[PDB]
Chains A and B, each alone.
Chain A
Amino acid sequence: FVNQHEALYLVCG
């Protein structure tokens, strides 16, 4: 597949 599908978060979802 095509690459459209890395970061830091305050809180886990």
Chain B
Amino acid sequence: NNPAIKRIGNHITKSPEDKREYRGLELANGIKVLLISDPTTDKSSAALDVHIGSLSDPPNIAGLSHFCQHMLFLGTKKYPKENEYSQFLSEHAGSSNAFTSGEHTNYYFDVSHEHLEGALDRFAQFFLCPLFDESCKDREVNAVDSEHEKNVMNDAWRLFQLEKATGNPKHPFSKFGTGNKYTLETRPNQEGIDVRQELLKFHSAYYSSNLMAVCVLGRESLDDLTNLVVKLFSEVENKNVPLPEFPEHPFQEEHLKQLYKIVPIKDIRNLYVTFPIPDLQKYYKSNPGHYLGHLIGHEGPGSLLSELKSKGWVNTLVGGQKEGARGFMFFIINVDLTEEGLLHVEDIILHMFQYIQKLRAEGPQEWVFQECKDLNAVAFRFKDKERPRGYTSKIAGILHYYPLEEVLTAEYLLEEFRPDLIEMVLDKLRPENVRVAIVSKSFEGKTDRTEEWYGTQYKQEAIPDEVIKKWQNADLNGKFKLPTKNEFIPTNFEILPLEKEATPYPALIKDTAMSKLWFKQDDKFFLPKACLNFEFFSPFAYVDPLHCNMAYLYLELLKDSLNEYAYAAELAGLSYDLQNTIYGMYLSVKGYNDKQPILLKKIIEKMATFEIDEKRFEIIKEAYMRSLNNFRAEQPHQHAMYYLRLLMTEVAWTKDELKEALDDVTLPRLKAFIPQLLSRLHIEALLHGNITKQAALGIMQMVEDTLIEHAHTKPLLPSQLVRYREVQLPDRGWFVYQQRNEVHNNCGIEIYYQTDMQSTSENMFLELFCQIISEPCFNTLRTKEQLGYIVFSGPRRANGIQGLRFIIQSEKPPHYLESRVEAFLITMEKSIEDMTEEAFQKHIQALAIRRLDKPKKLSAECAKYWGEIISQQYNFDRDNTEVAYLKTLTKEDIIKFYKEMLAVDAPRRHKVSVHVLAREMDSCPVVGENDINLSQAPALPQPEVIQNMTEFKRGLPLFPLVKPHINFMA
């Protein structure tokens, strides 16, 4: 029947725990579609993936596909308005984004479930009648240039492009996909090229329905979703475009047995080993590449990493297959490098081949395959319910690789044991097919080449035949042994029955001087999982820079010590996070509840009886020093946020103070520190998931008893549970702190308009206002003015206080950026006064939906509760309470709020600005003074420049702390 539908796939295989309904189908024009019905979803979404990417960019216009990606949001014939799409989503609690890879351009969005069609309609036009407006083209080009500019000094991006430039230059893999102003404007201009026309041609030539896949999720029934998609996408024209293929590998003979010495931006030491391999995508039912990745990349006893670490040459290792494109892939083994390791690269590589030889000697093991198969099946069956936006975008992409019926299970459920494929891939991991890259500052001044797109400095050399020979003659090393059965594999998945006293929110079930225990048995996800969060309070974790360094080192040494044992648990879906905080320590264990008690007990026991390995201590200390210094290489806006944090927080040690006190941390000092840190503590925990009250109480008490027995831990005094306050800015005051980024040639800025302490009314005044200015800020400061790629506005919450913040990274100086933000504020005032009552009520409804969006998985609901606990506000019913108050606000309330707290002449304006200057910028005024289609910046007063952070805080009062919400139990 239905001529618009070529076929409706059979039952879509899903997890028996997945209540969502699915329907696969292929439209007449060839678009693969997957419909998902979820009658309970608060937000609906859709995504469309075009199987064409930067690899198909015309040789003379690098980055065109990426540019087309940006341009499609800027207007269509049906919806001409430059921001009709984004504005519509914003006003309906939605969001959107997109990315471009070598063979894909993925577009996606989410929106209130009641406005799926309105959003899908505007979205579908992207692939039917884009405008590619000339004015939008000249402006948006700056956004692309700005995006590339931020990656320029990024080591990951530089290495990513260096690999492409080190392969066959004739191969499309060598293309620069990001593109910039030069390649998208300048170059084409001085070549008589009309980018507008090129975009029209590219889109017309590659945006064919036969190469498109779509996924839509909404509350509507599968039949309604079907008619919806047919009605909006069946008109996409099918030009039967051939799927681009790349059978010849970018790395040919002359590209093998090559060594590269690279100079990084940050002070890092890394060794990258790469092997060219065939495209293994078609073997998804067996995944021979992952099999080898699992073995070679194993941490755990007898692994390559274990020996490499014991020898003090490496700290971390990553192994396995890496995607390339249809026709080719790579197999890598990347490792971290210690100072000693840097001097033994040849030996490290020999060990890599010795381990590989071991795998050849033992041959493929079915029990290993069986183990991964079982774990993958368990993972799929109990997979957490995903957020719509990410789910649709992911499905749209994978619809291009798997049959409709298998789209959900394809990446999880293994079916075939293939020793023939495993051996085939292992046969490619040989010395004569290797590429080795070393990244180190020690190569500074020893390089003779430069990568054009990023300016990366490196040197290329052929690996001497004897070195290759020695690796080829790699023999068995007794230190290398295959892993043993994973004893952490879960077997008990029974869901405990909901207890009679089960509560809607966490309940305080223990309130002692030693610990405060919040508990909630899962009442909606019903998966065999649990989240155990613990907050250990101790004044000695942040008393001074030295102790902060020791707190960090201690936990870092601890995790490094448990790694081998904890890796098996990680594979079995049982992980943990352990880190030092400004108040002590934070520990979180999550995953299948079955064996959590075992891992937890092990962690605490290890914590209270830790014996530091001197060698591990020195190496980890050296890496930490490096990590502190490397912050200088972070982006300008990250620096701005960093400085503001230091400025507004009562107590905060800087990275300079920390590394300065780091040379004072000795093994003896660290050994004395640990017992001191654990001597007195207070624990506030949240146990949430598939667990009973008695199990929770049991877990909590087990942690205390372990500390008491081995560390003789005593309760902390209530008066010692200190919380830091935020600096209280004076009415009508304006302070400016200026610094310079010596790595990035871009400026960064953060403007903070402090309002008042957090509370129901104050919270919603700020949030409603941010909701109203959110899309306009982006549209004005970026799409129109093109100040930069990174343009952000939103609420800032810290230490119980809150306000409005703006974050921008640009080529333009901070004082100019600030003038534009002030001009934008004026625009928003007029805009609010000029908006209709209904438009206002629309923003209220949008914020409401955003705040009431229900978490889809346990960790997300747990995080929300944890947020209430960590902030010590414990307002578990916050969303309902705050939204009810929100729906009470009028335009007048928001106008008054603005005039009293935000306006340039506001009686209670509390403003602080952080100016981060670009590398090649000696100074910059802190304030500055046509009309161009640019609005008028209000005139600003003279700011008080901050010369010393300490003095700044001393001369200002401190806000009080927010009073807790009262939660009564025992």
Contact = CB atoms under 8 A, between A and B. Distances in A.
B790 A12 contact: yes
A2 B331 CA distance: 11
Interface in B865-917: none
Contacts of B792: 12
Contact of B99 (A1, A2, A4, A8): A8
Contact of A2 (B66, B147, B178, B293): B293
A8 B66 contact: yes
Nearest to B807: A12
A3 B97 contact: no
B320 interface: yes
Nearest to A9: B99
B97 A4 contact: no
Interface in B54-75: 54, 66, 69-70, 73
- The SS class assigned to the A binding surface is loop
Contacts of A1: 297, 299, 317-319, 567, 570
Interface string B277-319: 0000000000000100110010100000000000000000111
Nearest to A13: B97
B98 interface: yes
B157 interface: yes
A12 B321 CA distance: 28
A10 to B, nearest CB: 5
B547 to A, nearest CB: 31
B100 A11 contact: no
Contacts of A9: 97-99, 147
Contacts of B160: 6
B321 A10 contact: no
A2 to B, nearest CB: 4
B377 to A, nearest CB: 17
Contacts of B234: none
A13 B877 CA distance: 28
Interface residues of A, number: 12
A10 B790 CA distance: 10
A12 B320 contact: no
B48 interface: no
Contacts of B293: 2-4
Given A2-B290, A3-B293, A4-B290, A10 B319 contact: no
A2 B97 contact: no
A7 B54 CA distance: 10
B101 interface: yes
B322 interface: yes
B177 A3 contact: no
A9 B108 CA distance: 12
A11 B611 CA distance: 47
How big is the B interface, by class? 20 to 34
A10 B73 contact: yes
Contact of B319 (A3, A8, A13): A3
A2 B69 contact: no
A6 to B, nearest CB: 5
A10 B96 CA distance: 9
A7 to B, nearest CB: 5
A7 B55 CA distance: 12
A7 B99 contact: yes
B332 interface: yes
A6 B98 contact: no
Contacts of B778: 11
Contacts of B178: 8
A7 B156 CA distance: 12
A3 B101 CA distance: 18
B100 A2 contact: no
Contacts of B69: 8, 10
Nearest to A11: B97
Nearest to A12: B790
A13 B790 CA distance: 10
A4 to B, nearest CB: 7
Contacts of A4: 290, 293, 320
Nearest to B156: A6
A9 B106 CA distance: 10
A3 B156 contact: no
A3 B66 contact: no
Contacts of A6: 101, 156-157, 160
A2 B73 contact: no
B127 interface: no
Nearest to B144: A8
Nearest to B160: A6
Contacts of B554: none
Contacts of B355: none
Contacts of A12: 789-790, 792
A2 B320 contact: yes
Contacts of B567: 1
Given A8-B66, A8-B178, A3 B332 contact: yes
Nearest to B305: A1
Contacts of B101: 6-8
Contacts of A2: 290, 293-294, 297, 318-320
Contact of B322 (A3, A7, A8, A13): A3
A4 B294 CA distance: 10
A8 B157 CA distance: 11
A10 B70 CA distance: 6
B35 to A, nearest CB: 25
Contacts of A10: 69-70, 73, 97-99
A8 to B, nearest CB: 5
Contact of A3 (B70, B318, B790): B318
Nearest to A10: B98
Given A2-B294, A10-B73, 7 more contacts: A2-B293, A2-B319, A6-B156, A7-B101, A9-B98, A10-B97, A11-B778
8 smallest CB-CB distances across A and B, nearest first, come from A3-B320, A2-B293, A2-B297, A7-B101, A7-B99, A2-B320, A10-B98, A9-B99
Interface of B: 54, 66, 69-70, 73, 97-101, 147, 156-157, 160, 177-178, 290, 293-294, 297, 299, 317-322, 332, 567, 570, 778, 789-790, 792
9 contacts: A1-B299, A1-B317, A2-B293, A2-B318, A2-B320, A6-B101, A8-B100, A8-B101, A12-B790
